[PDB]
């Protein structure tokens, strides 16, 4: 897991930027899917264009050889696409290139073989039809969960990147639907809204952190992933966001102790849609989106730049995530008063791949029913 510390720093860099833009919008994105897509794209770039991308993903190119970077991403893709996988993770990356371009076979080989991604040729001379084919690809890739992703292409587009990911996990220890009820969610210190709130009494991997001034809950999904929820103390949301570090997360993941608690956790259906040209440009990735881009690994003779780049991530959290009966189990609950831990005010969360400890998702809920 040589690249996991880098992915974690990329997740935090990207989160802190998005959190700076607006503090009153839900956030949800996939550090892994974005980083994988641009590590892949770098295989078609050279010199400064190439270095900017990998440096913008938090790789210090004076310290880590590039071979270890791509080997880390490929080993990560190997775990996320295992056939027998209950994790049910739907992600894709689509490269849409002008059909008039003479493409380098090596790049198309690396895209398909090394990164198991998709590259298409489109007539960008028909802007509306190209837009439709881009949206149809995403819509088909998500069986209709993500529709009308790209809303506008500029006439001069010759190369577009769409990165999508949809996740609805199945809890190893699920909630009972009968126990879900409408509860208050404190959007601020004097204001509440009603939201569907799951609840369960059980033995949870839960603790209060003095360092983070937050409750920290870890819940495992069927498959190879764990959700980490951070509930900041009154007035500590910003402190929480500032103090998160990869080392702090690792310590939580290594703790397996469980304690009784009465957990209240909102059902969630949230999405995040980001213009990666804008967002990654704030992290230093600019030349690949500019006329000066060195994409000679993609096409040798003609100029090229990445004109459009979008990420959309969709999250569903509910009681079971499936209609099938799960494996039954019994937890031994002591008779002492369980703490009441209610995720009923803004909180942060992170989903981690158990094998690599990579950050599959990161987000913030400011209002579950915001839209
Ligand atoms: C939490 Si409240 C009802 C004062 C703002 C809701 C606006 S929106 O999310 O519907 O855009």
What would the 3-class secondary structure string for 43-86 be? CCCCHHHHHHHHHHCCCCCCCCCHHHHHHHHHHHHHHHCCCCCC
Q: How many Cβ atoms sit within 10 Å of the Cβ of residue 333?
A: 12
CB-facing half-sphere around the CA of 346: CA atoms within 13 A: 22
Which ligand 1 atom is the nearest neighbour of the CA of 367?
1
The DSSP secondary structure of 257-301, one letter per residue, reads: --EEEEEEEE-EEEEEEEEHHHHHHHTT--GGGSTT---TTT-SS
Q: Ligand 1 centroid to 167 CA: how many Å?
A: 25
Tell me how the structure was determined. Answer: X-ray
Tokens of 246: 């990869």
| Residue ranges of E strands in the chain | 27-29, 89-98, 118-122, 159-168, 181-188, 191-209, 214-221, 225-232, 259-266, 268-275, 308-317, 340-342, 347-353, 359-365
What is the SS3 assignment for 33?
helix
Q: CA 212, CA 234: separation in Å to the nearest integer?
A: 12
**Which of 344, 345, 367, 369 has the most ligand 1 atoms within 8 A of CB, as the residue to mutate?**
367
Residues paired with 277 in a beta bridge: none
Which ligand 1 atom is the nearest neighbour of the CA of 370?
9
**CB of 255 sitting under 6 A from ligand 1:** no
Residues in the chain after which the backbone breaks (C–N beyond 2.5 Å): none
Q: CA 292, CA 161: separation in Å to the nearest integer?
A: 18
Which ligand 1 atom is the nearest neighbour of the CA of 369?
9
Q: Ligand 1 centroid to 20 CA: how many Å?
A: 19
Are 4 and 79 in contact by the 8 Å Cβ rule? The answer is no
The set of residues, in sequence order, having a beta carbon less than 8 Å from that of 156 and lying 6+ positions away, is 307
Tokens of 96: 């849409």
Nearest Cα to Cα of residue 122 among 132, 130, 131: 130
Beta strand pairing status for 268-275 and 27-29? unpaired
Q: Ligand 1 centroid to 331 CA: how many Å?
A: 39
Are 252 and 244 in contact by the 8 Å Cβ rule? The answer is no
Q: Ligand 1 centroid to 238 CA: how many Å?
A: 21
Domains and CATH numbers, the chain: 1-171+267-320 (3.30.497.10), 172-266+321-371 (2.30.39.10)
Q: How many Cβ atoms sit within 10 Å of the Cβ of residue 287?
A: 22
Q: Report the b/e string of 210-245 with b at 16+ CB within 10 A.
A: eebbbbbbbbbbbbbbbbbbbbbbeebbeebbebbe
Residue 100: alpha-carbon gap to chain centroid: 34
Residues paired with 169 in a beta bridge: none
Resolution of the PDB structure in angstroms: 1.8
């Amino acid at each position: 897991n040589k690249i996991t510390p880098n992915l974690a720093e990329f997740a935090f860099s990207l989160y802190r930027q998005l959190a700076h833009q607006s503090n009153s919008t839900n956030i949800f994105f996939s550090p892994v899917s974005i980083a994988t897509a641009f590590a892949m794209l770098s295989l078609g770039t050279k010199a400064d264009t190439h270095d900017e991308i990998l440096e913008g993903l938090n790789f210090n190119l004076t310290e880590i050889p590039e071979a270890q970077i791509h080997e880390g991403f490929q080993e990560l893709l190997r775990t996320l696409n295992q056939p027998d996988s209950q994790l049910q993770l739907t992600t894709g990356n689509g490269l849409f290139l002008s059909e008039g371009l003479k493409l380098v076979d090596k790049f198309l080989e690396d895209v398909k073989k090394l990164y198991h991604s998709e590259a298409f040729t489109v007539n960008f001379g028909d802007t509306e039809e190209a837009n439709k084919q881009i949206n149809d690809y995403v819509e088909k890739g998500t069986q209709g969960k993500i529709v009308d992703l790209v809303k506008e292409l500029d006439r001069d587009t010759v190369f577009a990147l769409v990165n999508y990911i949809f996740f609805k996990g199945k809890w190893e220890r699920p909630f009972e639907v009968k126990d879900t009820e409408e509860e208050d969610f404190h959007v601020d210190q004097v204001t509440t809204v009603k939201v569907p709130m799951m609840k369960r009494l059980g033995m949870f991997n839960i603790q209060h952190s003095k360092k983070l001034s937050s409750w920290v809950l870890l819940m495992k999904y069927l498959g190879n992933a764990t959700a980490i929820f951070f509930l900041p103390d009154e007035g500590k949301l910003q402190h929480l966001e500032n103090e998160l570090t990869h080392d702090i997360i690792t310590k939580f993941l290594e703790n397996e102790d469980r304690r009784s608690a009465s957990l209240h956790l909102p059902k969630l259906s949230i999405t995040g849609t980001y213009d990666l040209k804008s967002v990654l440009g704030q992290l230093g990735i600019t030349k690949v989106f500019s006329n000066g881009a060195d994409l000679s690994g993609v096409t040798e003779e003609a100029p090229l730049k990445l004109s459009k780049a979008v990420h959309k991530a969709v999250l569903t959290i509910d009681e079971k995530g499936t209609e099938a009966a799960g494996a039954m189990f019994l937890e031994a609950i002591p008779m002492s008063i369980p703490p009441e831990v209610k995720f009923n005010k803004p909180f942060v969360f992170l989903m981690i791949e158990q094998n690599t400890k990579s950050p599959l998702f990161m987000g913030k809920v400011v209002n579950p029913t915001q839209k």
